[PDB]
Amino acid sequence: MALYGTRTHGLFKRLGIPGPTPLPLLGNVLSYRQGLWKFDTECYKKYGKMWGTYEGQLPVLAITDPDVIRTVLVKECYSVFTNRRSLGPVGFMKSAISLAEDEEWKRIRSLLSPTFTSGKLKEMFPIIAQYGDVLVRNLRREAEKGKPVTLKDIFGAYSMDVITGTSFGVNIDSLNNPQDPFVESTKKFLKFGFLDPLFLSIILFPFLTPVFEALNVSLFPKDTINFLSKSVNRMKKSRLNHRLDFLQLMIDSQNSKALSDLELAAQSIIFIFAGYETTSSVLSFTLYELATHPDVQQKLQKEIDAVLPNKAPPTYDAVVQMEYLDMVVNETLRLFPVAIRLERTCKKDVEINGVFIPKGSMVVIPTYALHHDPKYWTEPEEFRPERFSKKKDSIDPYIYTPFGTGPRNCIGMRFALMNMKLALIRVLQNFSFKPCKETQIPLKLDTQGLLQPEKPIVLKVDSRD
Ligand code: HEM
Ligand SMILES: O=C(Nc1ccccc1Cl)N(Cc1cccc(O)c1)c1cc(C(F)(F)F)ccc1-n1ccnc1
């Protein structure tokens, strides 16, 4: 098959860009089975500054130079690298900001940015902090049994709870309501992005996307999409007969081009999708590191108690004072950047660092590989929150990209950091975490989708009182 399915496969050779030999039709996609985080790390070690791979026929150029990264993510964002990976079959979800393209993305990002400011976070803090209470008592009921706790169920419930309450102003108590159609629908998001036959065919043959769209085939759970879209239209219609949440802000902006009713539903769903799995995973990763580093956990516990004595309820200003908590979260996101990488598409032919890249090619910023580079991080595999202390050198924002950077960065980063810090404060005020004989040590990572532990994180949870 040396001449069937190898049409673009000589591009990087003619450019002088190194990279592993692709296979006909598949390209290098078989190398994804070990995990994208592992593939990016090994390619970085082997080839250095730049390497090229093929997703089927699609050329993929990875770059690690901070200056080139700044060029792709900031300087030429609106001019060359405005979109990400080519859109798959998603139906009306194509207007969600995470999947919008070109001028449609610019308008929707513009309309939504007032919702995600630090000012808006301050006003919404009390709504968010209320869900720390549900998290603590959920954790208490499971800790009271003396039996080790599976964190993914607790923090998965909190993650779904807090993002749903911030979105629609309703507490769903996910852990204790598994028959709720909303809870059952949203859990189906956990199976997204796996390298199943349909997903693999879309990456290999992106020209099949209009076929699957015409067949009403989607990468999202269609039933979940239809329920949430119907639930959104039910909630706005009920409000037509002083609410502070994501939905109300979008409704008000709609009554102030404007957001379409379909576009509003896409954003509402995508906010739940974005905050659900990622926030839960980082929270579970943080506690593994705290349990396996009790000195860090006790030092963090000391800072919480010094800022909020007598189990004081957290305030926005109290969180800003917790320097070590910021260091712990930052270092957890260095070790486990759950999105693994950043991706952009060349909207036109472009010269990247003196290399010609054809229109349509993908550029990858390997966040995970850059996060584990010993060139930038002393003992890169060690959990050391001390890297992010003000007594060290400034962190390069193009090397450390857990939320991306530039105009296309994570719009919900502030809210995500807040959601995680609040949860960490509450549980650490009440509980201490230590490993048991069931704790996978050292931790091993999965090989598909978002960064996730290969086996669920299980820990012994002891009340401080
Ligand atoms: C710890 C949790 C999170 C992590 C680690 C994370 C990470 C990321 C990353 C790496 C990107 C890609 C940025 C790039 O292309 O430069 C992104 C995009 C995005 N995230 Fe998050 N994210 C998190 C939570 C959230 C939450 C809770 C929301 C919803 C409120 C959200 C909404 C979005 C949106 C809308 C985009 C696309 C922005 C655009 O296309 O302009 N994210 N996120
Ligand atoms: O990793 C993500 N999803 C995922 C989940 C499970 C397995 C595999 C994957 Cl890839 N991402 C992060 C992301 C990636 C690219 C552009 C973005 O804008 C954002 C995500 C994806 C989408 C989308 F494209 F699938 F619709 C929507 C939102 C997010 N998301 C999560 C946190 N913040 C944003």
Helix (H), strand (E), coil (C) string for 64-83: CCHHHHHHHHHHCCCCCCCC
Contact predicate 29/55, CB 8 Å:
yes
Cα–Cα–Cα angle for 246, 251, 254, nearest 5°? 130
Find out whether the peptide bond into 313 is cis, omega within 30 degrees of 0. no
CA distances from 120 to 36, 117, 372 (A): 35, 5, 34
* Alpha helices (H) in 89-150, listed in sequence order: 102-112, 118-129, 131-143
Residues 6+ apart with CB under 8 A from 352: 61, 63, 68, 71, 72, 363
Sequence letter at residue 44:
Y
In the chain, what are the domain boundaries? 6-464
| Closest residue by Cα to residue 143 from 464, 460, 436, 465 | 460
| Cβ–ligand 2 contact at 172 (below 6 Å) | no
Q: How far is the CA of 429 from the centre of ligand 2 (A)?
A: 32
C-alpha torsion sign, points 412, 413, 418, 419: positive
Q: How far is the CA of 435 from the centre of ligand 1 (A)?
A: 31
Give me the torsion for CA of 262, 187, 344, 247, rounded to 10°: 40
Q: Which ligand is nearest to the CA of 102?
A: 1
Q: How far is the CA of 9 from the centre of ligand 2 (A)?
A: 28
DSSP string spanning 210-273?
HHHHHTT--SS-HHHHHHHHHHHHHHHHHHT----SHHHHHHHHHT--PPPHHHHHHHHHHHHH
Q: Which two tokens stand for residue 30?
A: 């078989």
Dist. CA 314–CA 275, nearest whole Å: 21
Dist. CA 318–CA 311, nearest whole Å: 12
Number of H helices, E strands in the chain: 18, 9
Q: Of 189, 282, 413, which is best to mutate to test ligand 1, by the most ligand atoms within 8 angstroms of its C-beta?
A: 413
**Spatial strand order in the sheet of 342-345:** 50-55, 58-63, 362-365, 342-345
Q: What is the CATH number of domain 6-464?
A: 1.10.630.10
Beta-bridge mates of residue 51: 62
| Residues of each annotated binding site | 410
C-alpha torsion sign, points 124, 127, 129, 135: negative
- DSSP designation for 24: T
First-to-final CA distance of the chain: 68
CB count within 10 Å of CB 269 equals: 24
3 state SS of 312? coil
Q: Which ligand is nearest to the CA of 336?
A: 1
Residues 6+ apart with CB under 8 A from 249: 114, 115, 120
Pocket of ligand 1 (CB under 6 A): 97-98, 109, 270-271, 274-275, 278-279, 282, 338-339, 342, 402-404, 408-412, 415-416
DSSP string spanning 404-417?
--STTS-TTHHHHH
Instruction: Count Cβ neighbours within 10 Å for each residue of 277-304 and write b for 16 or more, e otherwise.
Output: bbbbbbbbbbbbbbbbbeebbeebbebb
Q: Give, using CA atoms, the residue closest to atom 16 of ligand 2.
A: 98
| Cβ–ligand 2 contact at 157 (below 6 Å) | no
| Cβ–ligand 2 contact at 98 (below 6 Å) | yes
